[PDB]
Amino acid sequence: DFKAIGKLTQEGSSMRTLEPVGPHFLAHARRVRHK
């Protein structure tokens, strides 16, 4: 289907830190250890 690839403005994302609690973090923590 129609699918386009766009690039976010390089300054659109600043470095921040997260709270390592909850199932949604722990489930996502699995993906990071894998890669």
SS3 (DSSP) at 23: helix
Burial class, 19, CB count within 10 angstroms (exposed 0-12 / middle 13-18 / buried 19+): exposed
**Distance in Å, CB of 35 to other proteins, minimum:** 9
**Distance in Å, CB of 7 to other proteins, minimum:** 6
Q: Which residues contact 18 (CB under 8 A, 6 or more apart)?
A: 25
Each residue 1-35 as x (binds other proteins by CB under 8 A) or -, in order, gives xxxxxxxxxxxxxxxxxxxxxxxxxx-xx--xx--
Amino acid type, 11: E
**Distance in Å, CB of 31 to other proteins, minimum:** 9
Residue ranges in contact with other proteins by CB under 8 A: 1-26, 28-29, 32-33
